[PDB]
Amino acid sequence: DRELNEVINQMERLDGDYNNTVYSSEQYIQELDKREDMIDQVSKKLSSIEASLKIKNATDLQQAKLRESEISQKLTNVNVKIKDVQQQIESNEEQRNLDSATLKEIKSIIEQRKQKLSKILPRYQELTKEEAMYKLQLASLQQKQRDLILKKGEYARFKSKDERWIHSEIEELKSSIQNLNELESQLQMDRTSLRKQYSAIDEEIEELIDSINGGQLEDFDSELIHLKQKLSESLDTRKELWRKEQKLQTVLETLLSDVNQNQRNVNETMSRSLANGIINVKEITEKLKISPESVFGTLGELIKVNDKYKTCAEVIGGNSLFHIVVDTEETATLIMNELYRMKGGRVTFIPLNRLSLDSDVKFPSNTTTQIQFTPLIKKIKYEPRFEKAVKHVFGKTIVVKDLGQGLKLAKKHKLNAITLDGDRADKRGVLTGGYLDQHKRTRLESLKNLNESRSQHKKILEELDFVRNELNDIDTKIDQVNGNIRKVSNDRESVLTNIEVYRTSLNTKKNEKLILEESLNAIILKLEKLNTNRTFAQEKLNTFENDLLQSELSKEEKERLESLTKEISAAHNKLNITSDALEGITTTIDSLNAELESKLIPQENDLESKMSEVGDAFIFGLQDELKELQLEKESVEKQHENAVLELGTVQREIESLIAEETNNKKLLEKANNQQRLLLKKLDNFQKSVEKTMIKKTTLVTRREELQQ
Amino acid sequence: QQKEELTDKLSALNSEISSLKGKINNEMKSLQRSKSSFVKESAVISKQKSKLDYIFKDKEKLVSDLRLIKVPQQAAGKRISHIEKRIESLQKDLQRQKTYVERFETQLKVVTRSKEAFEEEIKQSARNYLNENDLKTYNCLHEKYLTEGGSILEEKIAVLNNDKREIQEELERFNKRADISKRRITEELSITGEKLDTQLNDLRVSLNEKNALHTERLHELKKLQSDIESANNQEYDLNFKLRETLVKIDDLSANQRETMKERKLRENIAMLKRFFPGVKGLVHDLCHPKKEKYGLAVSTILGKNFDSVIVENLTVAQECIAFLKKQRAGTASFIPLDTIETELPTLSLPDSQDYILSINAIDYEPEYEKAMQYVCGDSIICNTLNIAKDLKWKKGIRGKLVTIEGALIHKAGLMTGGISGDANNRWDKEEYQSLMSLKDKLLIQIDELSNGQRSNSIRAREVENSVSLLNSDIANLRTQVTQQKRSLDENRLEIKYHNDLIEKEIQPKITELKKKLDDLENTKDNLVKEKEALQNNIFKEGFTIKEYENHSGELMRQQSKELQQLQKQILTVENKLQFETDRLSTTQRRYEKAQKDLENAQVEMKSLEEQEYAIEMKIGSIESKLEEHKNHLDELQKKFVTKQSELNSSEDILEDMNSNLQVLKRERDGIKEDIEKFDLERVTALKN
């Protein structure tokens, strides 16, 4: 009876064939798993890229809205500058039209005035000739008519005759009255001298006024203009800083939101028993006295590990990633008691004050055959001060290439063993292991994100402090500019008030000095008249006294009287003829001369007004041309900058949209491929499970058959 | 024997009926899914069309808004031009008024001058209406007249000289008075111009003050709106903290799903047990939790193995791990019975200080009690924290001792504490709605925050504008102060000129009185001369006209001088009329310029009104079209939400059907293959 043995051998051959089929299916599943791992890595990269793309969409879209608002504001400023340039061009065109019109009018008026002046130059060739003659005739009449009156008076005086003189009495009048005239001369001496003193005083006052009339005001105005320009530049810089600070605040808020989202994602993984513990230990930390900064946070943020074995760390880390280190044990006990309505779960503390039981550990790596063995402490960056605690955690956790060798060395030496691929073994005899997906202890990965978020928050706080300092500086500069402007205005007002008082005083003193000079001229004329009267007295009365001092006869006197009468008649006739000719010439010429003078008077005033207006218009036109050129240059520069900025923003928006569309399409394709791969993997796993069940049944049947 | 076969056949028939029903259900679900996919395709097509229409409408609205904004700049320019035109018109009206007053004054002066010239001509005409023997008689007549009145003639000559001096003084005073009058007229014109400028400045200052008050009110309103936005943001932040508590409840539900995934790994281990020999299972049910004392305690300390599994052989552990790799099951911890031998003999019962030891409070059979005493080690339990500290710190032995409530000290001295009040919760489907509501609220809050940021930017711009307005107001105040100082100086100068003119007139009154006295004396002298002439007439039968070579000739010369002065006054009146005509020509040119400017302003205003009306009509049409499109898009979005909910329900139904089909297929593999194995065993038995 050997057919049972043949059946057993056939079953063994079938089991071997099933094992070969399982190996082929495992190779196919390994290829599919490599494809699925590549697809999953691509999908994670695409999901990160899409989250970044959406965050960029929101943030850079607010930024692009702000940039478009700034570009529109620049375009509106350029449009306002162009409107102002057009207004200045219209003002210049009106000024040029007024120049042309008023200049034709001024040319006509100047031609008329020059014709009148040329006629009046000929009129003077005529008026001077008429004058010379009229003045000569008037002098003759004064030397004839007044001479005639004097001769008549002399004849009347000579008419009186007393044989038994009165001349002595006349001498008294020649002496006393002349003495009175001398007293009048004394009045002239007291007036001419007084007039000279007043003239000297007026000259000194005029010199003093002219000295003040003269520099400082121009320098003050220039300084005020420079201060105003500096204030405008400071205001522009402050506006730019305000825009930069607003953008910084917006991006900081976006970063804070992203950090909060990342923290929530990280917390989504931990068991809530210890999540609530973390929360409670936190608000207790910010509640009670933690001034010495005894809290050092979780283990993860205090150590980094080489990525090549990072997985290992995490699997050997586990809950140990969340160890908290505190300076003093008493603090930990007090905190734990203060969880007196405990609403959270697991939470551990490791005091530094009594940190002990960290026994010394010696690594046998000195000998050979430990190349496969890699101490983990060699791959960790940490603060040396905590070495003991760290050693308690990752010290004695060894890395092995083979699980059997790891167990052998664990038996030889009491250390926890694990493989690079994550086959965690226990020194005490337990064994651990299992398949691990791409998900892991993301807290360590999220620890870097949290640190970056904290750094960004610190940078945002520094930027806010700088913005506050800049705003304070801008306010101080504005206050200083306003104070300087007010001081300059007050100084200019005081200088102008002093100058106006000086000018009013100068005008009043000049009117007074003109009145005094007219009085002095009148006094000089009176003194000349008094001297002439004294000479006439000394020539008539003194001469008569001298002659009579050496008759009651007037033979020669009678002849002189007859000659005087004849000369008086001749002078009357000559004066009549003169007066007639002079009046005719005057009516002929002086009427037109005065008419021309009157016309030129209003004409002269109109010409002066036109000249002043033309000068002001020319100065204003030059200034407006310079301002228009500067404004045109500035507007061209601003338009170029705005166009460049708009083109850049449009290009960035188009690129972002294209990238978003491509990412969405790639994500959809990757999702479809992943679904297909998952279906294939599920089918393969079901087939493998069926094959394993069949193999188990065959083995059971073979054992039952061999039992006999 | 055959009873098992009959039972297997009945079970197979029932499984086949169930599989047929499940296949029918799956076919119906597939048809429904295809219909839903077609509906979703149509819905997304409609949504894309609506989005394109909305994009076109938004582009049109943005174009209209930009056109209107440019219209704001054109309107500002037109307003500036109209303000300039109104200022020019006011200046032209003030001119017209002053020029008309001056023209009336000049016409009155011209009429007076013409009347004076006519009167002078009439007087001259009235005024312009002596022999050999007569001369012989006049010789003796004049001789006698002189002999009689030489003193009278001398007095008359002196009076004439004094009158000439007084007349010279009177003309000097009159010239001074005329100069003061001309200065006063010029000062009055300057004061009128300065008063017009000051009135314009005062109107500008009032307008600036009104604008500053309006801007301050607008800034206060903006600050109040910003404060209200900040308060609403704080309220929305509190509401978002409340919504994050709902997100936290959703995370707890995901934690329940994670616990279910942990449960799944354990029936996979049980499947391995059915496939591998002599496996025990999880340790949760291998412990005694009765008495409700330090019940959780042990679990806490034993947590690392409290979720581990006991297996026969370490080789079995490795092959199970390989199976986990092959079929992607999961990760767990294994304790094989072939390695526990390490630390069995630790069965000491030393002094316990009247306290319970871990093994004492656990149910067991020999190898499980081996396993638990191995894993526990030196685990001890105490009653209170103070008792634990007294029994631990005071002693030199360090170990894993825990309190009744959970506080524990590790073998290395890690003091630890914590207790949680669990709240078993479900309602993930309700959370799906709560999460969606929270997301919508967060989106609304983000939109509100963006609006608040825009409002803050607008407020900053308004603050800058207010600062500029304050600077302009300060400049205007300085200009007004300067104008007031100039007006005060002009008033003081006018007062001084008036006082000087009053003093000159007072002096002119004395001069006129002296002239009148001299004229009276001259009249008396003329009466005396007339008496002398009448006395001489006793022999006469003239003299005033005979010396018309001197008396009436001088009178005619004076009359000619007066006529020349009247002609000069007429020429001055003609020059004033020419000045008035030139001012009227300038005013007519200004009227033409103002008419052209008013026509241009009317054309610009008409163009602006037409552009504004067109923009308003376009904006209204776009708003109506956008409201209709938004209503259509809201209806489409509601339909799409309903379709998405239906698709989710269909997907859940399909997942349930697939799970049922997989269970049935596994049973058939575990039943149909079981039936085949039973048949093979029966056939083998029949071989005997």
Numbering used by the authors:
A (entry chain B): 236 to 399, 402 to 451, 456 to 791, 795 to 952
B (entry chain A): 247 to 375, 380 to 791, 797 to 943
Q: Could you give the paper's own sentences about this structure?
A:
Cohesin is composed of two rod-shaped SMC proteins, Smc1 and Smc3, with a dimerisation interface at one end that is connected to an ABC-like ATPase domain via a 50-nm-long coiled coil. Interaction via their dimerisation domains produces a V-shaped Smc1/3 heterodimer whose two arms are connected by a central ‘hinge’ domain. The ATPase domains of all SMC proteins are separated from their hinge dimerisation domains by 50-nm-long coiled coils, which have been observed to zip up along their entire length and fold around an elbow, thereby greatly shortening the distance between hinges and ATPase heads. Cohesin’s association with DNA as well as its abilities to hold sisters together and extrude DNA loops are facilitated by three large hook-shaped HAWK (HEAT repeat proteins associated with kleisins) proteins; Scc2, Scc3, and Pds5.
We present here a cryo-EM structure of the apo form of cohesin that reveals the structure of folded and zipped-up coils in unprecedented detail and shows that Scc2 can associate with Smc1’s ATPase head even when it is fully disengaged from that of Smc3. To investigate this further, we used cryo-EM to determine the structures of the S. cerevisiae cohesin trimer (Smc1, Smc3, and Scc1 containing cysteines specifically crosslinking the three intermolecular interfaces; Smc1-Scc1, Smc3-Scc1, and the Smc1-Smc3 hinge [Collier et al., 2020] at an efficiency of 20% [data not shown]) bound to either Scc2 (EMD-12880) or Pds5 (EMD-12888) in the absence of nucleotide and DNA. The former revealed a coiled coil folded at its elbow, causing the hinge to interact with sections of the coiled coil that are approximately 10 nm away from the point at which they emerge from the ATPase domains. Folding brings a pair of helices within Smc1’s hinge, namely the end of the coiled coil around A520-F526 and another short helix around L564-R578, into close proximity of a short stretch of Smc3’s coiled coil. Though folding permits an association between the hinge and the N-terminal Scc2 sequences, which could in principle stabilise the folded conformation, we also observed similar, if not identical, folding in samples lacking all HAWK proteins. The resolution of the folded coiled coils and hinge (5–6 Å) not only permitted the identification of the contacts involved in folding but also allowed identification of candidates for cysteine substitution for potential bismaleimidoethane (BMOE) crosslinking to assay folding. A 5.5 Å structure of cohesin’s coiled coils in a folded state enabled us to identify a pair of residues within the Smc1 hinge/Smc3 coiled coil interface, namely Smc1R578 and Smc3V933, whose substitution by cysteine led to efficient crosslinking by BMOE inside cells, demonstrating that folding takes place frequently in vivo. A pair of residues, Smc1R578C and Smc3V933C, were viable both as single and double mutants, and gave rise to efficient BMOE-dependent crosslinking between Smc1 and Smc3 in vivo only when combined.
